[PDB]
Design a protein around this ligand. Sequence first.
Ligand SMILES: *[C@@H]1C=CN([C@@H]2O[C@H](COP(=O)(O)OP(=O)(O)OC[C@H]3O[C@@H](n4cnc5c(N)ncnc54)[C@H](OP(=O)(O)O)[C@@H]3O)[C@@H](O)[C@H]2O)C=C1C(N)=O
Ligand SMILES: *[C@@H]1C=CN([C@@H]2O[C@H](COP(=O)(O)OP(=O)(O)OC[C@H]3O[C@@H](n4cnc5c(N)ncnc54)[C@H](OP(=O)(O)O)[C@@H]3O)[C@@H](O)[C@H]2O)C=C1C(N)=O
Lengths: 452, 452
Amino acid sequence: IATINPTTGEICQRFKALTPAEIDAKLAKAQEAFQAYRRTSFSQRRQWLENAAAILERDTSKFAEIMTTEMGKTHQSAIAEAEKSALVCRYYAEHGEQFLANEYTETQATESYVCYQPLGILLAVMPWNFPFWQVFRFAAPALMAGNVAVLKHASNVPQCALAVEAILEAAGFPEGVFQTLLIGASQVEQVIKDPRVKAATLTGSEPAGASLASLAGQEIKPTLLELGGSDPFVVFPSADLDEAVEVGTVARTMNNGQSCIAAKRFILHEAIAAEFLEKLHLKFASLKIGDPMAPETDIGPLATEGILQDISRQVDQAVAAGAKILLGGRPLDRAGYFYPPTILTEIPPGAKILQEELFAPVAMVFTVKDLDQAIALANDIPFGLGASAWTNDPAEQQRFIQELDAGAVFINGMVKSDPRLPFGGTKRSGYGRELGLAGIRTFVNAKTVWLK
Amino acid sequence: IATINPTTGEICQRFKALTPAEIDAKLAKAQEAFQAYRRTSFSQRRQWLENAAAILERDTSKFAEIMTTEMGKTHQSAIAEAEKSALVCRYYAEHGEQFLANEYTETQATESYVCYQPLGILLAVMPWNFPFWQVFRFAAPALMAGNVAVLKHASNVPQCALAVEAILEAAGFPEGVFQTLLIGASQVEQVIKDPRVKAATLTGSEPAGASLASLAGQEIKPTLLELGGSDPFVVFPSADLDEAVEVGTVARTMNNGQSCIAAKRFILHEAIAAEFLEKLHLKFASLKIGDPMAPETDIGPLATEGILQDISRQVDQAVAAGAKILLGGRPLDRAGYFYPPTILTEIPPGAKILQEELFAPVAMVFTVKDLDQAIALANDIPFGLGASAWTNDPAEQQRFIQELDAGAVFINGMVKSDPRLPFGGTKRSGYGRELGLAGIRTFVNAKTVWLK
Ligand SMILES: *[C@@H]1C=CN([C@@H]2O[C@H](COP(=O)(O)OP(=O)(O)OC[C@H]3O[C@@H](n4cnc5c(N)ncnc54)[C@H](OP(=O)(O)O)[C@@H]3O)[C@@H](O)[C@H]2O)C=C1C(N)=O
Ligand SMILES: *[C@@H]1C=CN([C@@H]2O[C@H](COP(=O)(O)OP(=O)(O)OC[C@H]3O[C@@H](n4cnc5c(N)ncnc54)[C@H](OP(=O)(O)O)[C@@H]3O)[C@@H](O)[C@H]2O)C=C1C(N)=O
């Protein structure tokens, strides 16, 4: 557990992991806090949540600097992330009570309804790629619902993890309602197996999700998994090509490519493929790579040496198999974990890369001849998180919406998360939904009540 | 896999388990069937579901005889079970389309909404205690939603399992949309690990649920677990005592005691405990034990020799520890797996039985002094399925509703399932909800759509 600046490779600060006894003490405190917190009014929870939003809104640049220092996303995009974190806090402050109101169903009972009550301690395991937003995405509805939470954040963002707890303390949430656990992956099993822990949510890779979900399953505890994707970005002949190129470039390269809903596989109708690809090539080549603290920077370093090694290998093996590099395709010879925007074409059938997530600014490009071929190729992956399709033909739009095997389909725009709309995967991308109504309904006891 | 009549102990018919190759073939057919079935209209699904209801409504006595023969519940209660099976078919026929309609949310999109689409093949693992109802509980919404299903039923109800498939075939559901798998517990892992199987649901005991959920978690597949309970039946001084005794007797002894939402622990306020307990004793004492095919029978045999052995041991060990037998407490000296209505009192603190499910007509009785003590004792179990409380004081009613740790709280009535209201557990009783809106929302892709 350490801050290692990916721009310089320098070790900035190390942290001692909690011991099992310390983890136990935190869970005992969470349980005690829950017994009181479940009795708080929505007005109190709303006040504290809105206070947290105001803290995020005031000190956006400072929080952004922590994110950038630890994991290398641009400071400007980290500012946006802090702003979006405030937004989801406000969303559940504004809607959470209504979303949890009794729902009455007419029967022969004098009263029959479902009410919604918190479960207790929720474990959250989170990744470094959106180190504030993913935490607030689960924490805002958890806290509004009256759950308490323990967070196991990624081992390379301890300062972000501590900052989130500090924000919630300063906002006024009682001690034990939210606790950051500075612990490694091997220490999570103790938490899942603790009788006081009632549920678990993980955003991350498949092996992490499989580990957490298998353990939780053994303990009869509900889970939600938000895993990776290889989202298609489909461009058809009636599309606004210049908009599609611009937006596609952002979709692939934002967050230095490290997003679950990045545009990863560009699927181009043959009628427009040559024009699109040339423009894509030019746009990618103009991106500014460098110090993520500089406001002009488009592409900072990848977050870790491991990610750099992995993408470098994935690309090298694809090229060895016969894939062509249109742009990029090799790590930069400079300090920090830098990998350039890359475009791969003519990838051989059966190449392993076709089935993998490229968690870096590396676009795979394909050409197709018709709608059926586009949909088949789009779905020919183990994942099913998001999908974007570009067309102004209403019949095509409807087929894309209906037939793309994903948790989200965006027509003529890049996939984005928005607190107003539920968000989650299908297939190997996970199950369950965050945000919207779903986010606050996942980890509550929907209690049926019948009164004679 | 066999029909063994629990009234006589006679082995009536044996069945060959499917081989792994045969299971694979059924999954291949389910996948092909799903590809077409997902394209059917709600009108077709509704027709087939309503046809299934009409079949159940016409031949209720015949289906009931199969249930009674295989697992020993009274023929009269099996008729009611067939009727309730028809009811949940009609519920989803009548509401399913509306329940799955697009839900629009205003954004800057021209259109933004959530739509609901089937996942694919759902595995269901079901128990012998309600061999028709629990199947239709999951199958009706699955089929209305456009999923297909494979059923692994309990090994002692193969004729029930085959009958459910035959009903659905006769109703018009296309081949492969629903398939009964005559397979043992060891064969379920293959099904969960098959890439075509997208989700799994289990109703049963904790070890079964832990096995299925841990395996599904490893495969990144969503689950729903409906497990056992030790539901409290709390009786306070303002209760209608005679009604509470009558209803409590039904709640403990229906289905020969073998219900997840049986009243298992009677928690009596000291002011009324003597009167209530005497009346409960009297009611249990005069229940008619005998051939479950006879309409006058209240109590048939327990379903299996294993259940009989288990309850006999649980009671014996409790008594050896110091518990008192007010009534019953030993197997009957006759053919078939008969165990009599039993009441245990004065159970020593720390006796293991206090924490166990009594899946037989055996009531544990406790006395308490006030509301706080009643709630504490009611919740002092690993389970949390249902809870019933009897009082006509509004303040007490509200505290019971709010503070009983269960998925369902019934005031002045016994806990029952009803298609109109969601149903499920908390704590070690499971997670997820069947019935109501919840039942048809569990295993669908909630797909967010955003159209510029
Ligand atoms: C949208 C945004 C992101 N994602 C998807 O997440 C992954 C990110 O990849 P990576 O950072 O490499 O994930 P990871 O799984 O290694 O780590 C994530 C967290 O899980 C912990 N962890 C790893 N392994 C385990 C085990 N076995 N048990 C418990 N916890 C584990 C990690 O801990 P450390 O190793 O850092 O200590 C970390 O906390 C991409 O696939 C991305 O697409 C999902 C999104 C969405 N759907 O919302
Ligand atoms: C309302 C009604 C019932 N219940 C709860 O269910 C159990 C019933 O007890 P029992 O019949 O003894 O359950 P079981 O778990 O042994 O068997 C149930 C099904 O699961 C299969 N099975 C057992 N073990 C496994 C494993 N390891 N893997 C997969 N499948 C398994 C059984 O198969 P067979 O052994 O018969 O072949 C069977 O299909 C009580 O606790 C009751 O309260 C839940 C209800 C509710 N919440 O809705």
